[PDB]
Amino acid sequence: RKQISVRGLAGVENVTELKKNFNRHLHFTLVKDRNVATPRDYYFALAHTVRDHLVGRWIRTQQHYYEKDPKRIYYLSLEFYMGRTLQNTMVNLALENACDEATYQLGLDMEELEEIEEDAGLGNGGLGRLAACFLDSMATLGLAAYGYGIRYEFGIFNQKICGGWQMEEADDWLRYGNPWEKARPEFTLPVHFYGRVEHTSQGAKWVDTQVVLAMPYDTPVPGYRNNVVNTMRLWSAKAPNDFNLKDFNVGGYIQAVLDRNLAENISRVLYPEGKELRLKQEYFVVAATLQDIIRRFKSSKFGCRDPVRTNFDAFPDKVAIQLNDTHPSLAIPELMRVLVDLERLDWDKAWEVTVKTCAYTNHTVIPEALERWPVHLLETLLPRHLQIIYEINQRFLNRVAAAFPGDVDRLRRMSLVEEGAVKRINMAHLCIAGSHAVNGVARIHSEILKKTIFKDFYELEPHKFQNKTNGITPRRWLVLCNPGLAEIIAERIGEEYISDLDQLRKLLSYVDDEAFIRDVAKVKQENKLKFAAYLEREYKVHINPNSLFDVQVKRIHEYKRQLLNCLHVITLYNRIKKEPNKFVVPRTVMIGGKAAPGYHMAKMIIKLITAIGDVVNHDPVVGDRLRVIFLENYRVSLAEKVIPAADLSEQISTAGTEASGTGNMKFMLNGALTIGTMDGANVEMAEEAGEENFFIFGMRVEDVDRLDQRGYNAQEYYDRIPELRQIIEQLSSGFFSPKQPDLFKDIVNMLMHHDRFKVFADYEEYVKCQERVSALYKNPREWTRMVIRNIATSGKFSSDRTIAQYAREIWGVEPSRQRLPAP
Amino acid sequence: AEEAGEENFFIFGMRVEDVDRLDQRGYNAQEYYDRIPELRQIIEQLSSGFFSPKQPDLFKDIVNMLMHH
Numbered sequence: 001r002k003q004i005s006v007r008g009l010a011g012v013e014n015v016t017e018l019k020k021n022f023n024r025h026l027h028f029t030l031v032k033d034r035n036v037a038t039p040r041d042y043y044f045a046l047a048h049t050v051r052d053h054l055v056g057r058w059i060r061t062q063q064h065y066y067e068k069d070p071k072r073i074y075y076l077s078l079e080f081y082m083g084r085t086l087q088n089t090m091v092n093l094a095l096e097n098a099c100d101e102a103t104y105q106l107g108l109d110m111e112e113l114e115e116i117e118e119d120a121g122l123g124n125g126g127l128g129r130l131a132a133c134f135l136d137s138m139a140t141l142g143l144a145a146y147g148y149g150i151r152y153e154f155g156i157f158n159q160k161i162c163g164g165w166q167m168e169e170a171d172d173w174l175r176y177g178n179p180w181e182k183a184r185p186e187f188t189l190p191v192h193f194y195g196r197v198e199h200t201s202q203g204a205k206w207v208d209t210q211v212v213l214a215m216p217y218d219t220p221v222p223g224y225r226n227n228v229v230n231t232m233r234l235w236s237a238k239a240p241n242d243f244n245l246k247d248f249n250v251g252g253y254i255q256a257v258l259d260r261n262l263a264e265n266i267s268r269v270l271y272p273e274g275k276e277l278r279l280k281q282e283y284f285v286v287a288a289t290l291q292d293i294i295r296r297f298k299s300s301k302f303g304c305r306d307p308v309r310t311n312f313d314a315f316p317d318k319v320a321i322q323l324n325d326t327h328p329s330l331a332i333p334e335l336m337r338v339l340v341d342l343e344r345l346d347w348d349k350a351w352e353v354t355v356k357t358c359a360y361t362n363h364t365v366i367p368e369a370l371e372r373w374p375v376h377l378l379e380t381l382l383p384r385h386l387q388i389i390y391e392i393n394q395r396f397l398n399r400v401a402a403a404f405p406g407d408v409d410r411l412r413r414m415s416l417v418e419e420g421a422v423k424r425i426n427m428a429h430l431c432i433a434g435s436h437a438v439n440g441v442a443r444i445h446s447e448i449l450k451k452t453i454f455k456d457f458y459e460l461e462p463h464k465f466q467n468k469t470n471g472i473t474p475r476r477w478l479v480l481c482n483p484g485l486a487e488i489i490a491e492r493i494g495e496e497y498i499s500d501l502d503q504l505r506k507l508l509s510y511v512d513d514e515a516f517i518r519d520v521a522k523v524k525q526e527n528k529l530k531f532a533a534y535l536e537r538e539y540k541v542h543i544n545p546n547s548l549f550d551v552q553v554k555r556i557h558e559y560k561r562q563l564l565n566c567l568h569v570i571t572l573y574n575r576i577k578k579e580p581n582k583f584v585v586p587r588t589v590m591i592g593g594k595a596a597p598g599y600h601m602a603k604m605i606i607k608l609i610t611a612i613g614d615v616v617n618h619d620p621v622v623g624d625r626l627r628v629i630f631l632e633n634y635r636v637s638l639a640e641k642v643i644p645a646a647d648l649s650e651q652i653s654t655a656g657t658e659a660s661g662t663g664n665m666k667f668m669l670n671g672a673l674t675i676g677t678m679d680g681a682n683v684e685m686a687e688e689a690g691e692e693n694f695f696i697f698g699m700r701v702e703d704v705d706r707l708d709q710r711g712y713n714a715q716e717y718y719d720r721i722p723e724l725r726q727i728i729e730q731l732s733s734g735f736f737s738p739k740q741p742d743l744f745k746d747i748v749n750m751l752m753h754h755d756r757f758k759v760f761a762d763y764e765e766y767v768k769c770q771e772r773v774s775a776l777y778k779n780p781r782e783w784t785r786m787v788i789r790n791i792a793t794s795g796k797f798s799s800d801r802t803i804a805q806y807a808r809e810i811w812g813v814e815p816s817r818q819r820l821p822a823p
Numbered sequence: 824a825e826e827a828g829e830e831n832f833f834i835f836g837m838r839v840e841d842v843d844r845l846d847q848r849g850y851n852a853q854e855y856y857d858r859i860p861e862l863r864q865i866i867e868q869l870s871s872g873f874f875s876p877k878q879p880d881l882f883k884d885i886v887n888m889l890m891h892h
């Protein structure tokens with residue numbers, strides 16, 4: 001027994017040992033040899049050779065949190081946007097050097113190998129990327145943190161561009177498996193659907209329930225050189241498989257073939273209205289998760305530390321639950337259910353624990369997005385939690401009766417049940433009522449939740465409403481994607497910045513130093529050169545590596561206004577044709593996003609964006625002064641490639657629309673200047689960098705409301721501006737579309753008659769901004785120094801701060817960048 | 824109208840050539856709500872919850888349609 005120990009298992013940065021474990025895994029774990037090993041085969045042996053170093057400190061970290069028994073906090077989210085783990089695990093584990101040299105000796109190229117890895121299709125967007133930067137920051141500042149959520153077999157779609165129209169292919173990333181996960185079939189948990197509530201004696205008894213088993217997979221997430229490794233636990237669904245003769249449902253009829261597939265694709269598919277599968281997926285993750293949580297509470301040396309019930313009295317001192325958005329919300333009615341029906345606490349003690357346990361992050365601004373479920377759906381599948389949720393509602397509405405007596409209209413505005421045709425339950429109100437801290441995600445966004453969207457809740461409990469501005473992590477989004485900038489920042493100010501980013505302010509002393517200025521412009525020239533190469537080698541175009549690299553990589557929605565940007569590109573076009581010989585700053589405009597299958601404007605937009613570019617990049621007079629490229633199937637591996645290259649960050653959402661914007665911050669950090677409205681994340685980065693160093697432009701949020709007030713009448717603009725009047729007629733006549741003139745007919749009308757986001761309003765000033773942009777560009781030394789002021793001011797946007805603030809201000813635990821002894 | 828004669832019919836409103844004009848320039852609803860007082864009045868009855876006292880906010884998507892699209 002005590003001699004079964006982790007101790008003698010690793011002589012790390014040693015090339016001769018890493019060669020050894022390489023050859024162990026290729027052969028013994030993969031049961032392959034060099035005569036038949038593929039690059040995938042060698043990709044997996046390396047994966048595993050690095051993994052052994054991982055699980056060893058998973059080990060040590062997790063032994064250490066059990067001995068030390070800290071507040072350990074469960075980050076629940078239904079999408080974890082991870083993307084490629086190898087280089088990120090090596091750099092974080094300090095193994096990058098010895099592994100590269102090692103594979104160099106084995107005569108394998110590690111970069112060829114690192115591109116075999118499939119982009120972890122657990123996520124889709126922001127909500128998911130945010131979960132992955134937050135898990136990195138929580139390791140680095142050694143928190144006892146767990147990321148929880150479903151395992152999606154099929155990611156979401158992997159896009160293809162066939163003929164300028166978008167095609168969704170599927171991401172079967174788990175095809176040759178995943179070397180970074182450990183299946184734990186041992187810990188498979190039941191999760192019940194449907195049923196009937198038998199109100200028996202001391203309680204209620206949820207009977208006749210269908211079961212779906214949740215089987216968990218574990219994945220390790222390493223810190224920045226601190227030897228803590230934390231866990232990411234993703235759940236997979238498995239139907240019970242008695243379905244053959246055992247149950248006597250069957251024999252006679254196996255039409256409950258359906259049970260087993262309606263269970264299975266809980267885990268299969270990401271999403272992507274009121275569909276029972278979303279609700280079964282969300283409740284799937286909550287239920288499994290919280291049984292793990294209370295399993296670890298009563299086990300984690302607290303089965304010894306009972307004093308009363310193994311009391312839930314001290315549950316909020318050992319658990320923190322973060323409801324990232326309204327997808328986890330049945331965490332509040334499920335933790336009561338367990339506490340109240342299964343253990344036996346009464347409702348007021350059990351409620352005490354829930355509210356002190358639960359905290360809720362909101363990411364939406366428009367009331368039209370907040371999530372809401374029909375009471376007839378919840379009665380059918382969760383009939384017991386409909387009960388609890390009504391009692392939660394009743395008692396909350398008497399609290400509001402305490403506080404504003406006489407009020408009739410707040411009872412009904414504030415309530416969890418919503419009236420109309422289709423009686424709904426408002427999930428955002430559930431969260432506020434059973435959580436002890438509600439937070440937004442950028443200053444303005446948390447204020448307009450306090451001021452308009454949740455205000456009658458802001459009045460009953462103003463204490464609740466916090467804000468914790470998002471962040472990007474410096475490991476993967478500066479060190480990893482950009483070594484060249486990492487390095488030259490390190491010569492000057494040292495390595496602590498990577499685990500302490502505000503001290504990038506130190507850089508501001510080197511503003512006028514020409515060695516920094518030059519070096520800083522050299523690395524971009526490097527980065528652009530290499531990205532220019534990737535744009536030929538994997539996808540194709542003839543980029544001019546000297547051009548101003550204008551990239552917009554955002555979700556193709558109307559409100560994300562890529563169309564704006566298209567009016568501007570067509571503008572540049574028309575000028576280079578009208579005035580063939582005026583000096584124009586050459587640009588390469590790159591736009592990228594996944595449509596959202598079913599959203600027909602977005603499919604029409606990518607079409608515009610390809611054919612503008614079919615026109616201009618082939619037309620002889622524009623030469624190499626302008627090119628427009630669409631960046632296909634934008635995902636995390638492409639972000640770490642094009643964000644290093646970019647000179648201009650295209651952040652143009654109608655103002656008042658964004659809640660924040662994490663690609664914004666990534667771009668700043670790598671010396672890319674921002675053109676952008678005074679919205680979302682742009683505001684505090686303008687505030688850091690100084691507005692002189694930002695390209696702000698277009699109608700501030702005040703002016704939006706004004707324009708709505710009197711009515712946005714787009715024709716007036718058409719009729720003042722002669723460029724605008726012209727590019728509309730070019731779209732319409734078929735100049736961009738000669739085999740189907742009439743194609744952009746529904747984009748032209750939209751803009752012209754019912755633009756809900758006012759593209760035309762900000763058109764004039766947008767391109768005036770753009771002209772500023774190109775000028776400064778044509779002045780290296782002053783271009784390259786704005787960058788330096790921007791990068792140097794990046795401190796407020798490292799996710800290490802966002803978590804440090806979550807830690808102190810909502811969860812109640814202290815940060816620590818201390819290196820656990822280990823390996 | 825033509826077999827009865829115009830005089831025997833109550834014809835009205837925007838004829839087509841006019842709707843095509845108001846589209847050519849862009850129908851800005853707001854203007855009409857701000858000339859006409861009784862219009863203002865009913866819009867403001869719809870949003871205040873006059874007709875809807877238990878969920879006042881109920882005809883809000885009607886009211887916004889009317890107002891903005």
Ligand SMILES: O=c1[nH]cnc2c1ncn2[C@@H]1O[C@H](COP(=O)(O)O)[C@@H](O)[C@H]1O
Pocket residue numbers: 058059062063066067296299301
């Ligand atoms: O009581 C314990 N003492 C020491 N280490 C433990 C104990 N229970 C769990 N561990 C560690 O915790 C890891 C995770 O277990 P879980 O958190 O219960 O799922 C194991 O792989 C062990 O390293």
Ligand SMILES: *Cc1c(COP(=O)(O)OP(=O)(O)O)cnc(C)c1O
Pocket residue numbers: 124125126129553554555560634635636637639640660661662663664666
């Ligand atoms: C950072 C990031 C994101 C985040 O995109 P944004 O927050 O900038 O805005 P939306 O596009 O509107 O969500 C999404 N995808 C990847 C790959 C990435 O690195």
